[PDB]
């Protein structure tokens, strides 16, 4: 009753990356910026794939409202979506857990600290421990 009426323009079939890539035009009057969950569900039901093989990104809604334009991908399988899709956007869709690393500064500082050790550092640690014991 709210007339989301999603349509897909500029459809290109890509067997090279095993997907269909298109421009998602969302005409949503009396509604603001529908979601990507609704867009992935309602593109899954029209391209018959699954929810987790459909990927959407873009959606700059037009000035004055009532229309959002984006880009969309519908992969041939969930495994082929997880192979070819960026890890950030898999994290967006919940297909991948976010990797918990250190930050950029501590990663580079750890690298430059480890540049000062030649070898594994077991002998260095034993010598430093024994000499600093006396």
């Amino acid at each position: 009753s709210d007339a989301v009426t999603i349509r897909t323009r500029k459809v290109i079939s890509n067997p090279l990356l095993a997907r269909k890539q298109f421009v998602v035009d969302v005409l949503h009057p009396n509604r603001a910026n529908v979601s990507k969950d609704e867009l992935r569900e309602k593109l899954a039901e029209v391209y018959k794939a699954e929810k987790d093989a459909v990927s959407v990104f873009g959606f700059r809604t037009q000035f004055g409202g009532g229309k959002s334009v984006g880009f969309g991908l519908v992969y041939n399988s969930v495994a082929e979506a997880k192979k070819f899709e960026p890890t950030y956007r898999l994290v967006r869709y919940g297909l991948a857990e976010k990797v918990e690393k250190a930050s950029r500064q501590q990663r580079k500082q750890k690298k430059n600290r480890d540049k000062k050790i030649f070898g594994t550092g077991k002998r260095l640690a034993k010598k430093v421990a024994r000499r600093n014991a006396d």
Binding site: I12, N14, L16, L17, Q21, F84
Partner: protein
């Protein structure tokens, strides 16, 4: 200074790649290869920008490392491999073959050819010379050394290379009255027949080329590529056939085609 350069600035790229001014400071510097840097088209520019098959360069890498693309029958997994003029690009998935030929605006066109035409290419003879152990070789415009050529093959001729066994199937001489594909300059992409070749011993032999609409133009012989006889080209010509309509006739075509 100090060594070979490895970065190509955007705005220092060739203009026919049609890269947008914004979205990054750098352009894809082509690898070393068969074609010169400013007269070639890298695979990232062909796949991401012309065919729109990839959105990123990361996806161009993801396409090429599955050994999908192949240029001249060999796979070429490099992201910035210099696919230049006459090059046949086969995408085995999507079942299509492209020939990198210029459009008449001076740009590499998306030109789909058949699988029969994808089995060969054409090559402009750059030198005919005698190699070691007295063996004659011929060098084409894409760096191919082909041993034991026909003795009638001279410089500026065009050979037909078979792309599976890289031999000369046949060849076309450089005579008056044969088709030309102009591969350089402001007349780049134009197709016409040789009126005559003006000699100039000492440098820069000129060619007077006349197209199908009887418009003559003069081009240096570095930019002339013979593609066949009067009519009946050995390759399939792109859409437009190298005619160079003026801008008034171009807007006349656009208003006569968009009004239905």
């Amino acid at each position: 200074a100090r060594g070979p350069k490895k970065h190509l600035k955007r705005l220092a790229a060739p203009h026919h790649w049609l890269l947008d001014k914004l979205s990054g400071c750098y352009a894809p510097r082509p690898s070393a290869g068969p074609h010169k840097l400013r007269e070639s088209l890298p695979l990232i520019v062909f796949l991401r920008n012309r065919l729109k098959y990839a959105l990123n360069g990361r996806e161009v890498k993801a396409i090429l490392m599955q050994r999908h693309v192949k240029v001249d029958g060999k796979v070429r997994t490099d992201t910035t491999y210099p696919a230049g003029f006459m090059d046949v690009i086969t995408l085995d998935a999507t079942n299509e073959n492209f020939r990198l030929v210029y459009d008449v605006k001076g740009r590499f066109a998306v030109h789909r050819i058949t699988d029969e035409e994808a089995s060969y290419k054409l090559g402009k003879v750059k030198k005919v010379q005698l190699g070691k152990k007295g063996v004659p070789y011929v060098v084409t415009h894409d760096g191919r050394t082909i041993r034991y050529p026909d003795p009638n093959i001279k410089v500026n001729d065009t050979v037909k290379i078979d792309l599976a066994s890289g031999k000369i199937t046949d060849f076309i001489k450089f005579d008056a009255g044969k088709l030309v594909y102009v591969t350089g300059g402001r007349n780049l992409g134009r197709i016409g027949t040789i009126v005559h070749k003006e000699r100039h011993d000492g440098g820069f032999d000129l060619v007077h080329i006349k197209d199908s609409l009887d418009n003559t133009f003069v081009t240096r012989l570095n930019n002339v590529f013979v593609i066949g006889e009067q009519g009946k080209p050995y390759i399939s010509l792109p859409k437009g056939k190298g005619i160079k309509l003026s801008i008034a006739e171009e807007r006349d075509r656009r208003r006569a085609q968009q009004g239905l």
